[PDB]
Scaffold this active site. Sequence first.
Site, short mmCIF file in Angstrom:
data_model
loop_
_atom_site.label_atom_id
_atom_site.label_comp_id
_atom_site.label_asym_id
_atom_site.label_seq_id
_atom_site.Cartn_x
_atom_site.Cartn_y
_atom_site.Cartn_z
N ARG A 99 4.48 -9.50 0.08
CA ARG A 99 4.52 -8.62 -0.93
C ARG A 99 3.53 -8.64 -2.25
NH1 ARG A 99 10.19 -5.51 -0.98
NH2 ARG A 99 10.03 -6.88 0.71
N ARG A 106 -6.18 -9.72 -3.53
CA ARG A 106 -5.98 -8.90 -2.23
C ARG A 106 -6.61 -9.85 -1.01
NH1 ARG A 106 -8.60 -4.21 -0.49
NH2 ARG A 106 -9.90 -3.62 -2.56
N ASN A 138 1.65 -3.11 4.66
CA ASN A 138 0.62 -2.94 3.77
C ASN A 138 -0.11 -4.42 3.39
OD1 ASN A 138 2.34 0.07 2.17
ND2 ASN A 138 0.53 -0.02 3.31
N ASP A 166 1.17 9.51 2.81
CA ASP A 166 0.20 10.28 1.58
C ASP A 166 0.09 11.74 1.79
OD1 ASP A 166 0.32 7.85 0.12
OD2 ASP A 166 -1.54 7.34 1.55
N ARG A 169 2.91 13.71 1.53
CA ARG A 169 3.36 13.84 -0.22
C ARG A 169 2.52 14.75 -0.62
NH1 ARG A 169 6.53 8.20 -0.79
NH2 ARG A 169 5.08 6.56 -0.83
N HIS A 193 -6.13 3.87 2.46
CA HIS A 193 -4.79 4.16 1.93
C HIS A 193 -4.67 3.52 0.42
CE1 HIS A 193 -0.47 4.20 1.52
NE2 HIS A 193 -0.23 2.90 1.76
#
Lengths: 329, 329, 329, 329
Positions: A99, A106, A138, A166, A169, A193
């Site tokens: 996580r 990154r 992710n 997304d 949403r 994303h």
Amino acid sequence: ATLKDKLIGHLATSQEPRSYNKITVVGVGAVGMACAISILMKDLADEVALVDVMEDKLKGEMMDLQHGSLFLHTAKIVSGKDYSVSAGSKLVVITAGARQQEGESRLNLVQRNVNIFKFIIPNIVKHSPDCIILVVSNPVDVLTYVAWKLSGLPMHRIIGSGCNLDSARFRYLMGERLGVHSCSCHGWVIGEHGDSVPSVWSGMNVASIKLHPLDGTNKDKQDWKKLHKDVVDSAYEVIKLKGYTSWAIGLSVADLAETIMKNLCRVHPVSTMVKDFYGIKDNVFLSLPCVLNDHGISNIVKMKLKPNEEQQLQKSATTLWDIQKDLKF
Amino acid sequence: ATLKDKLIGHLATSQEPRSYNKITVVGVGAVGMACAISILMKDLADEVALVDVMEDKLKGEMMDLQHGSLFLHTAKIVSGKDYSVSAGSKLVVITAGARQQEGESRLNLVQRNVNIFKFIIPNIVKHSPDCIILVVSNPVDVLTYVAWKLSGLPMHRIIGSGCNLDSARFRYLMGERLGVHSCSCHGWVIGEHGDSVPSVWSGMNVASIKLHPLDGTNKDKQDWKKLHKDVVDSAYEVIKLKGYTSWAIGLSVADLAETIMKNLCRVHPVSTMVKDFYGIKDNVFLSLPCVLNDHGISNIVKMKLKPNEEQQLQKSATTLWDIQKDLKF
Amino acid sequence: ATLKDKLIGHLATSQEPRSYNKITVVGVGAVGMACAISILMKDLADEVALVDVMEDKLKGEMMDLQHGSLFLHTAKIVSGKDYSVSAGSKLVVITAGARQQEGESRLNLVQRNVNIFKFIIPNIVKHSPDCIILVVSNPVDVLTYVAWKLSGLPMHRIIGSGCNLDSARFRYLMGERLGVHSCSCHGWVIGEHGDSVPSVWSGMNVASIKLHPLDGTNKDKQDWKKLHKDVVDSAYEVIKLKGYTSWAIGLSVADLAETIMKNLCRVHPVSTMVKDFYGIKDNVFLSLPCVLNDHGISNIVKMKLKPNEEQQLQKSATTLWDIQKDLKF
Amino acid sequence: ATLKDKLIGHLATSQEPRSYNKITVVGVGAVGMACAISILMKDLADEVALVDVMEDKLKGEMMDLQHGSLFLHTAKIVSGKDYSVSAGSKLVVITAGARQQEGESRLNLVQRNVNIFKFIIPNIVKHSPDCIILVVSNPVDVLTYVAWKLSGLPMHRIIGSGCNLDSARFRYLMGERLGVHSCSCHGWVIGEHGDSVPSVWSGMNVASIKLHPLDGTNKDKQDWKKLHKDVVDSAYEVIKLKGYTSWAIGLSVADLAETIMKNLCRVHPVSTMVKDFYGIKDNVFLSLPCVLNDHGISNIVKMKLKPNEEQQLQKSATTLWDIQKDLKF
């Protein structure tokens, strides 16, 4: 002289046991159990196999689910630490990942996932030669690429959750603002994303009516732009509040599994190979509106983006290709 | 000169906004979120209101759920700390309770719940005069009585989760052992939910065929009795494994909500008032096969138990009435 | 320079079009269109092919159905006069037959159907090597045998509608009389579909409670027996009233297709090979409670009938074997 | 000393029987039985009442349906010649009408229907004060007006099937031509249902991409326009082939009932009062994209039509108002 023998007889002829619409879920976390109960409540598969490294949690997750057998329409639920349990799946949903830590880059976060994935995905494909893979994990665009690369599957059998949720949403938030159900409102968030997600202002509409033509327009200034910010924000909001996300995501994924499984040719903003699309030259995955059927990505919906937009598109592809400096540290 | 005004017009006539098949869930724990996503995926209510004391968790739970709007068929999801949010519900599911501590007596555990419930239930009824209550909270038979007592509702509008899930488990376990789906196997666990649950050996059957008549019988010795022990055990197994239960329970409850909401007159082993049934003389709730419709308990299915059985039945009623020494400590 | 070319692009990789949960319906009569819209509304197949000899009616039936595409979840609907249209079906429902004439003998009526079936079934199997056949056509027990015989399929892949609908009716009628939903009431009509259908009085129950033990009993005299007569009658009632039957039958069949397709191992009173079951010595099909999965009949539920009952059973088998003097006139 | 009394007991408290999501269908023709089995298979109502003048056909239609009880989730199905059977419906679907004769004028055909409707609708409203009416009967725009006028209902509780099915057809035909499911393709046929239906060329799109901008355009010449002609034609095609229409229509209507019943605020091209919308000055019903909830028409979606288009719109309104010279001959 067995109850079973006293009560169940046989025809002289029969055929070895069978599953044809098998689906496998990797990871029995919040995203995974969420994905798994939405598929089950949807009756998309005649078998659901659950795979995680956490023995206990897996077994107990498995049992909870079986006990509810009476209430469902999926004949066989199973779980395994071993990948052979997943042998013969139509579709694989991957929801296992690391996580991101205190002071994590990154690059370094993507590397950690590469080393977990090296153990997951190769085994999936060997047990399931004809599966399609659906990556939820992710960062999705990069993890999709990795899965692509680690497996050896035709690019069309490798899908990323991408920008579906997304969009779901954005559509919700339009809806609340407009007074119509989220499914009558139509807008598309595509690209990479997350924070770098492009909102196609010019495709937004209700009944076929373009908001853009009506509001005098809108893209640059007079509160509507907001709609995109808490699409990405309201997402951190959730975590800050609940401590994770599961529900909308799981549902999102059953939406995808239904299309694929029922061979619908429904259009979804999912993470695909966008190589030489919008002047992108390398091996990068991002979201585009795709038609899906039972073999994964059947086609691409060629949007007509502005430069402003495709520019942004290209800045993700670059940034992602950059990370793709993977295999160790 | 508003997008909304430019794009949405009006008929000259209209009527104030409306919800008619409203359902409320109390408690956004594992049982509550599980109950809540099964009702939603089932399309049982045109409104779902979520109520807990935990602000943050409630809000975030609420949001997760709304974001998935596109994927569902329930128009309005809401959450409140306040009970007025639940104003006008057809059905209320209560899943809030204390969990029993180190050195806790069933008496003291039941008292703790009485003091939480004093704040929940009275407010429910005032906001929802015509609701039916469904208690999931354990110990269920005693918490059902409490809810009964705290509310002032006709006894038929007070239902306990009771022994449904246990039966669903028994049916599962028969099924695995017999090779037929859990829904073709029929057996009933009734009485006091838990260790003291009576398994009606003599009602077990497949197609209409009584196992009892076939196996030479069975009740007393030659491994079948087992089927009841890990029905109650396999339940601790789950917890020991996962650290809680949610999935089978939630599904169990949507099963109940569908009957009630769709006015089905389906027979469920649920916790009811069993006063002067099987020689029980006081105000005790236990499981019996009940017909349900939209007004709660429409009828009782009069089993023909053995003494052995009804004896056991009576020992729960006594033991429960004993606890009913409530209102403080 | 085609809209299609301007708007839909491609991934470099793809795979030939596909249907895996294909179902075929023969006959676009009242029974056939009824069977066909219940499967579609049930989302049991990713393809439905419709086959009849009546060109016009077929095409128009086909179109009506396609126009509703937006409202369904089955990707591809097709119709053909030719059998190759049915190429690759999981399941075939046959609803084509002659209806029995003025002065027609059951022998002569069965012969007429043999000569129609000679053209249907052989072609089905050649186009669909791995299909299961489901015969709805009346007389069902004899037409099932014929289909069996004309095809060359393992006996387990040949099923007869048999006594399912009749049971569904009995259950309805109990229900109305008892005040509980038809799905909480349990009774079984087995044997030879129709006037000669045996009602297992001794398996009737609610919750696990045997009516027989409670009503003092009942089989011989005090109005309950009636329940079986208008199960078979109320069926002529329908015709006399509407001029045909379709609705309950179609639904009945989707019930069967769901089991099979979803591999459920659900128990149905369907027409099977009952050879050397209940002292039957020849090649006769009648109803027994069968477990179904995706390969057709997985098992038989061995009832414990009385002689009275099995006697009756044997009189059908004899009477049917007698007819089995087929191949011409 | 009744089986029923021996087997079903009672709680001391209970409440008079009840239906809350009642729906009524008028007319048990092809359209009516089609509408009725799609609502039932959809689980939209806890009661369905069927009303026609044809005794026999009604009763038998009613029975067919009840016999299938086991397979559904609607508790109570009823039929009546009398309107009191419809007492308390949420929604009424009218499918009763005359079909237009040899040498019949649209004026004279509309008059015939006025005289049938005088007997239907007034009785509906008296038994069902709070119902919403849904007119399927053709000519729909004029029959909608009549129903409006004969009942005395707020204009928002009077809906016409209008142009929904036509749109559903257009969407189908786009889909076949484009290779995407009919539900990813978006186009709208509005105006006066039938030959005079306006196809909003400029709202057509896939993912948010306007066909119009891509094909160089299209409205005037190079085969696409066709898409509208066999939308209206392919409809006569059906009849010429099958001898009637039912399937796509029924499904179309369940689509509408789900929105309304589940209070969705979904946008449909339905027949509404379009008075002083697009320069229309009188009391004429035509199709526009409407939001629906449980109280009927909640809002109108203001398209931005071209003059070409709104001109056409106005020519219907005139032509319809002209007919509105009703009450006799």
